[PDB]
JSON list of N, CA and C in Angstrom, two decimals:
[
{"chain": "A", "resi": 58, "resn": "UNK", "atom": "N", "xyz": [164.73, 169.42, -32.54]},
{"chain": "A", "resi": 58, "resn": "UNK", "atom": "CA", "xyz": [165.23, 169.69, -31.19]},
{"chain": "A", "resi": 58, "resn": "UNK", "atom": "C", "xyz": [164.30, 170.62, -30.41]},
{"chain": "A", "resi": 59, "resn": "UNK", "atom": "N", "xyz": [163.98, 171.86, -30.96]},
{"chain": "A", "resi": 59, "resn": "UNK", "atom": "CA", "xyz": [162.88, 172.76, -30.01]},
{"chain": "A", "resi": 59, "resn": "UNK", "atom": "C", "xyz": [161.68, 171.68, -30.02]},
{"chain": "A", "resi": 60, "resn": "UNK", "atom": "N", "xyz": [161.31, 170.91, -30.88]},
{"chain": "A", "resi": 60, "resn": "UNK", "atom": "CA", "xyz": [160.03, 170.08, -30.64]},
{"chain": "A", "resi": 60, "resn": "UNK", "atom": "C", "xyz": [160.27, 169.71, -30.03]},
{"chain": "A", "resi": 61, "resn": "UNK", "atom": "N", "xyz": [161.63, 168.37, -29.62]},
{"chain": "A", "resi": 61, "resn": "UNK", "atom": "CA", "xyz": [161.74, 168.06, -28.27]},
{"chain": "A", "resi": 61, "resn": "UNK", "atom": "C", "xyz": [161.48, 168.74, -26.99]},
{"chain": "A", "resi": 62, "resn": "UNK", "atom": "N", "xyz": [161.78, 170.20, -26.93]},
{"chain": "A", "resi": 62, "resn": "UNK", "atom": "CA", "xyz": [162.14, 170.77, -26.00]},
{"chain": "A", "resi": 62, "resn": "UNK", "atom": "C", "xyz": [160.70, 171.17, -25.94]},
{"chain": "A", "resi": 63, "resn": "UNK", "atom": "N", "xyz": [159.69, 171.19, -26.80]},
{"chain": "A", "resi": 63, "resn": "UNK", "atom": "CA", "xyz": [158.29, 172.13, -26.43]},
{"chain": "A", "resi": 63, "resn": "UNK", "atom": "C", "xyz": [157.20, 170.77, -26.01]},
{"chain": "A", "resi": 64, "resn": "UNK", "atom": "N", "xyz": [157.84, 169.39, -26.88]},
{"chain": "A", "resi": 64, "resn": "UNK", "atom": "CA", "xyz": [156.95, 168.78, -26.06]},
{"chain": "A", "resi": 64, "resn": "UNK", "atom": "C", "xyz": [157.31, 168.11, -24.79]},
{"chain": "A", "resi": 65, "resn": "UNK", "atom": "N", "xyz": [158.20, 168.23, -24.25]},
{"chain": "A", "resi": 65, "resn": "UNK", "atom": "CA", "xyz": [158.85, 168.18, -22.76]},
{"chain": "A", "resi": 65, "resn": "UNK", "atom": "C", "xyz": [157.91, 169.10, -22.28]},
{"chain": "A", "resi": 66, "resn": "UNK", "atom": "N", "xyz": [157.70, 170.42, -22.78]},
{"chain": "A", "resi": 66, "resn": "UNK", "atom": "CA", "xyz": [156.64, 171.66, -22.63]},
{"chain": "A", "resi": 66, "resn": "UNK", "atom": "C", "xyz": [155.69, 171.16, -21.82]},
{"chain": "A", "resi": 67, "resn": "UNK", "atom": "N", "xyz": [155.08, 170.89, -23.65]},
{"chain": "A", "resi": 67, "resn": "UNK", "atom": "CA", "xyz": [153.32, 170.33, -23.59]},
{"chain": "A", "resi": 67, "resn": "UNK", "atom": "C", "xyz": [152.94, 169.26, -22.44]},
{"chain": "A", "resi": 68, "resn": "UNK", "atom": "N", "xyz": [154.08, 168.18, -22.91]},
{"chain": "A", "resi": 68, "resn": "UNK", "atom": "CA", "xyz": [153.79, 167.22, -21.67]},
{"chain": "A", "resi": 68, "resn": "UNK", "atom": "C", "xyz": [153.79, 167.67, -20.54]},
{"chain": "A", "resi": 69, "resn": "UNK", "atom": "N", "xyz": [154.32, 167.97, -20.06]},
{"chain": "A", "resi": 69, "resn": "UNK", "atom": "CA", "xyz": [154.66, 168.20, -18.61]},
{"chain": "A", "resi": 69, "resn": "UNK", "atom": "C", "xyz": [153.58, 169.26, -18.34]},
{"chain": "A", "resi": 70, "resn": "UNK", "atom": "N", "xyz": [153.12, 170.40, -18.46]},
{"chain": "A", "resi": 70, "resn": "UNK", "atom": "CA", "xyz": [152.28, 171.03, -18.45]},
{"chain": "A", "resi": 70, "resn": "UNK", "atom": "C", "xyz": [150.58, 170.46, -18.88]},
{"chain": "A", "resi": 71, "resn": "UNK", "atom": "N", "xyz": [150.64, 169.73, -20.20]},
{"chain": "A", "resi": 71, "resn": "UNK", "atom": "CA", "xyz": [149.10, 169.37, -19.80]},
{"chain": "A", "resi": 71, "resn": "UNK", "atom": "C", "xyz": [149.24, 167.88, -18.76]},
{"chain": "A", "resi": 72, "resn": "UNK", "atom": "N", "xyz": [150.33, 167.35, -18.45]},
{"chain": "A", "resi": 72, "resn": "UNK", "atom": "CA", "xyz": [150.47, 166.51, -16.79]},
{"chain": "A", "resi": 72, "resn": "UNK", "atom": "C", "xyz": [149.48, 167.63, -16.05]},
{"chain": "A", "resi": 73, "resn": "UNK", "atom": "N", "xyz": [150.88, 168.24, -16.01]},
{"chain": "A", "resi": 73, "resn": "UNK", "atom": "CA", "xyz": [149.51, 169.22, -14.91]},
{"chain": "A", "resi": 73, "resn": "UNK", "atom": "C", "xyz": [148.15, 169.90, -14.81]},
{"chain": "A", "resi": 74, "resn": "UNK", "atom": "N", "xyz": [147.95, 170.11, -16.10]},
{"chain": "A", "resi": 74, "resn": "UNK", "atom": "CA", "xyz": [146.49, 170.35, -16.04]},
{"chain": "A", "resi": 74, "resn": "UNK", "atom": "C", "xyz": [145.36, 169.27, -15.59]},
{"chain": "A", "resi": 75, "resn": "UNK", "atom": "N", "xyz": [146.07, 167.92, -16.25]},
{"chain": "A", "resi": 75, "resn": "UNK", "atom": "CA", "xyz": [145.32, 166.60, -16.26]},
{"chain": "A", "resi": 75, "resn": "UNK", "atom": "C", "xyz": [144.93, 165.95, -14.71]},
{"chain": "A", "resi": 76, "resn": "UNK", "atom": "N", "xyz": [146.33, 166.48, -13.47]},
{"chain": "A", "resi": 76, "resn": "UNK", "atom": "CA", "xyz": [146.41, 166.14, -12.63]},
{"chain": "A", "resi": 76, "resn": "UNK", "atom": "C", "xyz": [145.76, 167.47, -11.70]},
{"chain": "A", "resi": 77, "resn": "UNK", "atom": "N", "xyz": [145.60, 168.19, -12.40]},
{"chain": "A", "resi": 77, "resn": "UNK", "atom": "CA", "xyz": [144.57, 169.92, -11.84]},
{"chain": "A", "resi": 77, "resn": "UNK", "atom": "C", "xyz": [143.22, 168.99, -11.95]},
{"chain": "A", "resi": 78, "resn": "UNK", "atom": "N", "xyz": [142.80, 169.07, -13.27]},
{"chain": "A", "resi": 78, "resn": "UNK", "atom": "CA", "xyz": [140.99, 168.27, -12.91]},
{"chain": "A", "resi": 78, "resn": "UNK", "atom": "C", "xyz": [140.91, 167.13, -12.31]},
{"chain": "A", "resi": 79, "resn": "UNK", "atom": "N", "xyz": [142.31, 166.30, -12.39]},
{"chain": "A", "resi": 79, "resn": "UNK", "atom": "CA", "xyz": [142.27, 164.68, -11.46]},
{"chain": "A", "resi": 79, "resn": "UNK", "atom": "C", "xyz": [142.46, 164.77, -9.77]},
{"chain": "A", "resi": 80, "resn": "UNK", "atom": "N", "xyz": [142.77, 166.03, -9.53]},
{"chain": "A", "resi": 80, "resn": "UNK", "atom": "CA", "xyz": [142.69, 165.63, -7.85]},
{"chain": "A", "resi": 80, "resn": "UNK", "atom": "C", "xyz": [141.66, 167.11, -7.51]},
{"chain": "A", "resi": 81, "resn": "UNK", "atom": "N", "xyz": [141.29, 167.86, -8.47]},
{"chain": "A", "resi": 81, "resn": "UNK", "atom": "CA", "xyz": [139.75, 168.21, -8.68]},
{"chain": "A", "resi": 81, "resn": "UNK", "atom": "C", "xyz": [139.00, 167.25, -8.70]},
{"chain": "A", "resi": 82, "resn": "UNK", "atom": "N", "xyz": [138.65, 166.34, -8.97]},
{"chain": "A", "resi": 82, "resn": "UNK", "atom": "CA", "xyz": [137.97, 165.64, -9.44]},
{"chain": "A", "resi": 82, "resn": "UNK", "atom": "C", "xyz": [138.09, 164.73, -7.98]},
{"chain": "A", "resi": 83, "resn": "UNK", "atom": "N", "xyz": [139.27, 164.14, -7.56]},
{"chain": "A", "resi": 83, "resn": "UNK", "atom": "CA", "xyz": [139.39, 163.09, -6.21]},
{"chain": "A", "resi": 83, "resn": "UNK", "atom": "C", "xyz": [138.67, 163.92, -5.16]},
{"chain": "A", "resi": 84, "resn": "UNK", "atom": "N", "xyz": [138.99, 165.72, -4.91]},
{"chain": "A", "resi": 84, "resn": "UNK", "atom": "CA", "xyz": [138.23, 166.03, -4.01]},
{"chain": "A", "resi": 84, "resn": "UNK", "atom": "C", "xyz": [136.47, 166.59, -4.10]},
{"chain": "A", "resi": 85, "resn": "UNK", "atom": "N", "xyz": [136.41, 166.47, -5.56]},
{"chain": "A", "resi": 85, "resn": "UNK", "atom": "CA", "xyz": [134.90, 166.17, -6.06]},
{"chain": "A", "resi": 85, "resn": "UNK", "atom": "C", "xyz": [134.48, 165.26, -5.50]},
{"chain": "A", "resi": 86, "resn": "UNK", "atom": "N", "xyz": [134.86, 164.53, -6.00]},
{"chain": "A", "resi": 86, "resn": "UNK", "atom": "CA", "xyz": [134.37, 162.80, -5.26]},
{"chain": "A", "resi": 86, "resn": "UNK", "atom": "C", "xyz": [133.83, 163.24, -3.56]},
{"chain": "A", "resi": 87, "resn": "UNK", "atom": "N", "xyz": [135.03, 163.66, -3.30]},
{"chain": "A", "resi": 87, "resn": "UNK", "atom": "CA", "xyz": [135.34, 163.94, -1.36]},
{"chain": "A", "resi": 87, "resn": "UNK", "atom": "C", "xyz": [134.08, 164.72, -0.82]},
{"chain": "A", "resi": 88, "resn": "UNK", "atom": "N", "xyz": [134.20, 166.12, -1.72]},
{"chain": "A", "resi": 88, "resn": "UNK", "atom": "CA", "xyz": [133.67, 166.77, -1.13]},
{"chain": "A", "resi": 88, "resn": "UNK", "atom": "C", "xyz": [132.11, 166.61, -1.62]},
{"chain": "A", "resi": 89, "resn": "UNK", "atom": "N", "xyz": [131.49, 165.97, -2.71]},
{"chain": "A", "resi": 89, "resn": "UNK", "atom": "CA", "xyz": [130.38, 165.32, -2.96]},
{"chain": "A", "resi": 89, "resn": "UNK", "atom": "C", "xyz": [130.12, 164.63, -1.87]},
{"chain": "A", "resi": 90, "resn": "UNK", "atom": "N", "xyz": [130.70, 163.49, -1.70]},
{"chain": "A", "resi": 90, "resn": "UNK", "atom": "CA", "xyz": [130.65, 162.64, -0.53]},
{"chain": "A", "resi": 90, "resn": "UNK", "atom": "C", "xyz": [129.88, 163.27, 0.64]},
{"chain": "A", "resi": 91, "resn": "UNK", "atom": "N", "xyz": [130.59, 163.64, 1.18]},
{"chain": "A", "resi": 91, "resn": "UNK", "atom": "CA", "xyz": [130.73, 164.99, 2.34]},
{"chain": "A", "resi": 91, "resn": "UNK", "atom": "C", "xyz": [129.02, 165.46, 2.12]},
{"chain": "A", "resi": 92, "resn": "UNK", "atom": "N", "xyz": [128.76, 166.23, 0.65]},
{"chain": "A", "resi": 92, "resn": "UNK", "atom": "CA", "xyz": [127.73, 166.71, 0.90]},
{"chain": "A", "resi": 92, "resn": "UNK", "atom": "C", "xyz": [126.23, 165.84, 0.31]},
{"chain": "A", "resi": 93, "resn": "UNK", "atom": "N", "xyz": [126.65, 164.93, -0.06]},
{"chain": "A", "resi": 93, "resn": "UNK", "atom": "CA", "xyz": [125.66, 163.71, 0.18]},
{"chain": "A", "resi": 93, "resn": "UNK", "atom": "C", "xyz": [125.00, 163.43, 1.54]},
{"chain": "A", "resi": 94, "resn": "UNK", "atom": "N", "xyz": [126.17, 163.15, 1.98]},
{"chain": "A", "resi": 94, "resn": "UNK", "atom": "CA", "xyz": [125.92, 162.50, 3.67]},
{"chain": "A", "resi": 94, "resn": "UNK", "atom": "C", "xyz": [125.22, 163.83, 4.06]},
{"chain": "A", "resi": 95, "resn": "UNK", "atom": "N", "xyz": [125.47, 164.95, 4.02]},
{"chain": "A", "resi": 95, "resn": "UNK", "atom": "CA", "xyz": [124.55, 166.41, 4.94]},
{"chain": "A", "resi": 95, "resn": "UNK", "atom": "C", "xyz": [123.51, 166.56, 4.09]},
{"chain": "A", "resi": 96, "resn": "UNK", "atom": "N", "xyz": [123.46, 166.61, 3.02]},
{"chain": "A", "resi": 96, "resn": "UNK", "atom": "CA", "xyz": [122.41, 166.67, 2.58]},
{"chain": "A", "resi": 96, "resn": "UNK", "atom": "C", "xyz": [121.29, 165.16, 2.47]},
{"chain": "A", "resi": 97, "resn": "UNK", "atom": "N", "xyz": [121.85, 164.32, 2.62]},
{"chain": "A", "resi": 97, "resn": "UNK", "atom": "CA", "xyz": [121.01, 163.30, 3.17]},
{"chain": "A", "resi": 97, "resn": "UNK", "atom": "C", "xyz": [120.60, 163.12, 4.33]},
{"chain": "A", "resi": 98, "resn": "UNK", "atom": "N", "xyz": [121.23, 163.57, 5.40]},
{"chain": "A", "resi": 98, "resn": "UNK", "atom": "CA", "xyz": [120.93, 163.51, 6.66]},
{"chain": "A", "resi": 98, "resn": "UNK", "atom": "C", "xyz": [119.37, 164.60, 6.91]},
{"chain": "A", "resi": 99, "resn": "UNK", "atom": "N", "xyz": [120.37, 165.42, 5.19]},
{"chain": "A", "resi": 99, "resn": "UNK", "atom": "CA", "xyz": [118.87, 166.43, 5.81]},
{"chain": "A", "resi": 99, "resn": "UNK", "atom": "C", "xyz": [116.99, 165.63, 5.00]},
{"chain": "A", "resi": 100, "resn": "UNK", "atom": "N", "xyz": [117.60, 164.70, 3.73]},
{"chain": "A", "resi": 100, "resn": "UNK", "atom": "CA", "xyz": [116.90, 164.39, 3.03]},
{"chain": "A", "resi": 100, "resn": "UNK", "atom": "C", "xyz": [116.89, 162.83, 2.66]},
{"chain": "A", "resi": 101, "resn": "UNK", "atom": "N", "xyz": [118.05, 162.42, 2.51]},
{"chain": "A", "resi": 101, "resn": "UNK", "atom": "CA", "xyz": [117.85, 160.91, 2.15]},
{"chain": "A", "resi": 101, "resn": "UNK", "atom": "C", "xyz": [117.21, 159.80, 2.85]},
{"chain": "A", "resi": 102, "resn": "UNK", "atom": "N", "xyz": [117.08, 159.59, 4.22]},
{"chain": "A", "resi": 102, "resn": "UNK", "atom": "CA", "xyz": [116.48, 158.87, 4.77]},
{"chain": "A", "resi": 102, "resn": "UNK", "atom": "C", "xyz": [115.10, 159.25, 4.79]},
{"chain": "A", "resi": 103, "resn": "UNK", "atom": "N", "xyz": [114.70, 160.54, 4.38]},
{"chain": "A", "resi": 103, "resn": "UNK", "atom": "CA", "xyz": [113.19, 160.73, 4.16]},
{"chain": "A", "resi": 103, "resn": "UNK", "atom": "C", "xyz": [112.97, 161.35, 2.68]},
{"chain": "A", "resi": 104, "resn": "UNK", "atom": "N", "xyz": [114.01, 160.13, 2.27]},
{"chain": "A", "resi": 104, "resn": "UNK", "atom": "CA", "xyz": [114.19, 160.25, 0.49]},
{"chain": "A", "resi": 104, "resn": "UNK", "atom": "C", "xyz": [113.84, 158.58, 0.27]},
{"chain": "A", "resi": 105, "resn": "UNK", "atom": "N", "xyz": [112.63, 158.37, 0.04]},
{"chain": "A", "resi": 105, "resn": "UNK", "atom": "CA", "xyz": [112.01, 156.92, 0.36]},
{"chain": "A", "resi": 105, "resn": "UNK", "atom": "C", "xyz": [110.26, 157.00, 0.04]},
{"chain": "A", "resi": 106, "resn": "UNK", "atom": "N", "xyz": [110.11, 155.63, -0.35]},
{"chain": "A", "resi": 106, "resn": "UNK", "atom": "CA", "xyz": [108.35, 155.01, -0.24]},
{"chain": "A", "resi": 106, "resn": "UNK", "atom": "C", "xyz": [108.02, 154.37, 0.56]},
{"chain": "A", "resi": 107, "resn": "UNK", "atom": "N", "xyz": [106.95, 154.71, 1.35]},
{"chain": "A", "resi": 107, "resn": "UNK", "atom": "CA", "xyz": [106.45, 153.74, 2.59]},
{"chain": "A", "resi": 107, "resn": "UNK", "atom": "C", "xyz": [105.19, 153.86, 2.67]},
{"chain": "A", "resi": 108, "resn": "UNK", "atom": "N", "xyz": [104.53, 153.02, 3.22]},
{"chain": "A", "resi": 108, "resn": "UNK", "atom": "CA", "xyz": [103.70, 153.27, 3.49]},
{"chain": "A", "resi": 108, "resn": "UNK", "atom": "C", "xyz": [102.12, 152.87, 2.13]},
{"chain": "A", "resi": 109, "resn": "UNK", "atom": "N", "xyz": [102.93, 151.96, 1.27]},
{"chain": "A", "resi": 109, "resn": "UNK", "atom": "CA", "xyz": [102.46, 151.72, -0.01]},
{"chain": "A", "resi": 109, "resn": "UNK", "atom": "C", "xyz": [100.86, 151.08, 0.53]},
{"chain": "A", "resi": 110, "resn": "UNK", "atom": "N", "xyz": [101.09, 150.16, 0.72]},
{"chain": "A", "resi": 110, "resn": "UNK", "atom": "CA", "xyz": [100.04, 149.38, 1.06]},
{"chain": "A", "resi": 110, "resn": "UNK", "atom": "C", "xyz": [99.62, 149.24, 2.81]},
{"chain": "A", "resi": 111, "resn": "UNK", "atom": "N", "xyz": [100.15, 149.94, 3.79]},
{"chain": "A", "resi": 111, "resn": "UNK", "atom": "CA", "xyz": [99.79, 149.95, 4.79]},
{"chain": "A", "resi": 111, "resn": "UNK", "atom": "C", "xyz": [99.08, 151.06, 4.99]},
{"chain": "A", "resi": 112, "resn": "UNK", "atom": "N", "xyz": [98.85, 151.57, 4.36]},
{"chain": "A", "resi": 112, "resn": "UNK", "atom": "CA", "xyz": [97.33, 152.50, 4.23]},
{"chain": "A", "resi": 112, "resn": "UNK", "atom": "C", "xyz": [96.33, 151.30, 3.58]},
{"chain": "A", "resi": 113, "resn": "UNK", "atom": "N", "xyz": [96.40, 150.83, 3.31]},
{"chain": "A", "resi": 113, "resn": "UNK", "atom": "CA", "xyz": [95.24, 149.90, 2.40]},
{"chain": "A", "resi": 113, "resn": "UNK", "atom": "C", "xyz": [95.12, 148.09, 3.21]},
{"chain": "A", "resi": 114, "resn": "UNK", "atom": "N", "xyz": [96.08, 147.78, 4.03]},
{"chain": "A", "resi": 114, "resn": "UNK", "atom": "CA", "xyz": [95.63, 146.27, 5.02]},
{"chain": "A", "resi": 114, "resn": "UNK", "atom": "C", "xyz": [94.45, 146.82, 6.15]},
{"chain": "B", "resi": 63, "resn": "UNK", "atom": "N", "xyz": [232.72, 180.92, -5.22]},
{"chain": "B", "resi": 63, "resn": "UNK", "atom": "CA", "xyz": [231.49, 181.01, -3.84]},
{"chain": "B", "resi": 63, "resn": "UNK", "atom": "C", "xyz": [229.95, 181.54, -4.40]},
{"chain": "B", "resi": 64, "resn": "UNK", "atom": "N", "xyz": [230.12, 182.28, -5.38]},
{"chain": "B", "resi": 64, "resn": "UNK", "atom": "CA", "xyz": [228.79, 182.93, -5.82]},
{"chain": "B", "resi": 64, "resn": "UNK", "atom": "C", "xyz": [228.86, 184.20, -5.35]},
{"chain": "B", "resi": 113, "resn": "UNK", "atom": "N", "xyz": [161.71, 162.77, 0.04]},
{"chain": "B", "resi": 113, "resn": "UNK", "atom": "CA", "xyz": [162.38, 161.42, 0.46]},
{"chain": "B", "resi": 113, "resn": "UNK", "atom": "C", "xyz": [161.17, 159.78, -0.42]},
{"chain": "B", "resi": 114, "resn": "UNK", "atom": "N", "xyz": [162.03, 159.64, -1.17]},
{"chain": "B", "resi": 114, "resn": "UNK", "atom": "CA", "xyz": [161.59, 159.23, -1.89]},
{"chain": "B", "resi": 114, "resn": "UNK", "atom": "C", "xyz": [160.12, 158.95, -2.50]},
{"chain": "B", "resi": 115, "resn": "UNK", "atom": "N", "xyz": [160.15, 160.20, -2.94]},
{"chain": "B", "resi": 115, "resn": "UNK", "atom": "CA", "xyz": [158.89, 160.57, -3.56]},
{"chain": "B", "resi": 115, "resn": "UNK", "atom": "C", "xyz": [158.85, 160.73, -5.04]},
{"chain": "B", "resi": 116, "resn": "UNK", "atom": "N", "xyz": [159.35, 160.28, -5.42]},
{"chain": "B", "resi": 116, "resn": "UNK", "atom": "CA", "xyz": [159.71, 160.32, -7.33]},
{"chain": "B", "resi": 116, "resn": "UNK", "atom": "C", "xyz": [159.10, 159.12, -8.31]},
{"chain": "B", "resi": 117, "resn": "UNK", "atom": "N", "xyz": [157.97, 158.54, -7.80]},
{"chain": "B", "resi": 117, "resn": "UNK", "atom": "CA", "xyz": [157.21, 157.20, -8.68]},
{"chain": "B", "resi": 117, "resn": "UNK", "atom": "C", "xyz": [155.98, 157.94, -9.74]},
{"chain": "B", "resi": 118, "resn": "UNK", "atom": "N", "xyz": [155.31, 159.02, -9.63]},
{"chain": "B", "resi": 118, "resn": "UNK", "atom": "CA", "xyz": [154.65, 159.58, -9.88]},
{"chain": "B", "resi": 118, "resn": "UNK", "atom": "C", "xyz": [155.29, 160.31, -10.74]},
{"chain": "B", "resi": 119, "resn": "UNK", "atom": "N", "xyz": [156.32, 160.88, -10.89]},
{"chain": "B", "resi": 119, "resn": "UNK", "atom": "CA", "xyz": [156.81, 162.09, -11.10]},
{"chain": "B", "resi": 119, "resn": "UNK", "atom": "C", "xyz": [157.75, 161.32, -12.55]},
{"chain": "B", "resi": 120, "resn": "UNK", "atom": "N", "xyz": [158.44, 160.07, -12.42]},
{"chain": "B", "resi": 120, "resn": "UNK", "atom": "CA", "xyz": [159.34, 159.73, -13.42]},
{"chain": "B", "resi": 120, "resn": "UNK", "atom": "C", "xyz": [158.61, 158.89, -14.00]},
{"chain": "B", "resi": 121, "resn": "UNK", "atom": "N", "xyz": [157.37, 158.91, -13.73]},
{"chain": "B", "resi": 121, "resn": "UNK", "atom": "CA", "xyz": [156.19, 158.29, -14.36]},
{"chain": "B", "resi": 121, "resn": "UNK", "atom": "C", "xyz": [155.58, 159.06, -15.44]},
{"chain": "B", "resi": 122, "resn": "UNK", "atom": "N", "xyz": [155.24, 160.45, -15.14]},
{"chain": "B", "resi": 122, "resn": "UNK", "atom": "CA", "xyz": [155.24, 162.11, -15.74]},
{"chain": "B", "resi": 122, "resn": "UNK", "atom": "C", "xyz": [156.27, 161.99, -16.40]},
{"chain": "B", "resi": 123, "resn": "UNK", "atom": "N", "xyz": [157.03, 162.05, -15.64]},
{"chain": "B", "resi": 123, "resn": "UNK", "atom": "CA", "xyz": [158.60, 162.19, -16.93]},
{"chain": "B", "resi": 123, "resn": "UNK", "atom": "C", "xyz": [158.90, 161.31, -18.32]},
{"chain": "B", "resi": 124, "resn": "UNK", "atom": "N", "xyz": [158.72, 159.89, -18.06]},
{"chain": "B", "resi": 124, "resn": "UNK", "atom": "CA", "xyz": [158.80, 159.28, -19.14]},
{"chain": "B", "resi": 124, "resn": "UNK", "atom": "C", "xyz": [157.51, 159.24, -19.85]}
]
């Protein structure tokens, strides 16, 4: 019976931990996102090769 | 004489 009652505990509590790093994790995603796009704006489009062989026609 | 927000949650639960 207390096992019942501690893993009602456990469960429910590591729920929440699980759902602590899982919408950590959704606004990881987000806020990655987010700093992809600014930091690409500052770098990704001149995050590239060009110019390979048009130095050389 | 004398408001329905519980899919997640009972999802957790079970």
């Amino acid at each position: 019976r207390q096992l019942h009652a501690r893993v009602d505990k456990v469960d429910e509590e590591r729920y929440d931990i699980e759902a602590k790093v899982t919408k950590n994790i959704t606004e990881i995603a987000d806020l990655t996102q987010k700093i992809f796009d600014l930091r690409g704006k500052f770098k990704r489009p001149t995050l590239r090769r060009v110019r390979i062989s048009a130095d050389a026609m | 004489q004398n408001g329905k927000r519980q899919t997640e949650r009972e999802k957790k639960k079970k």
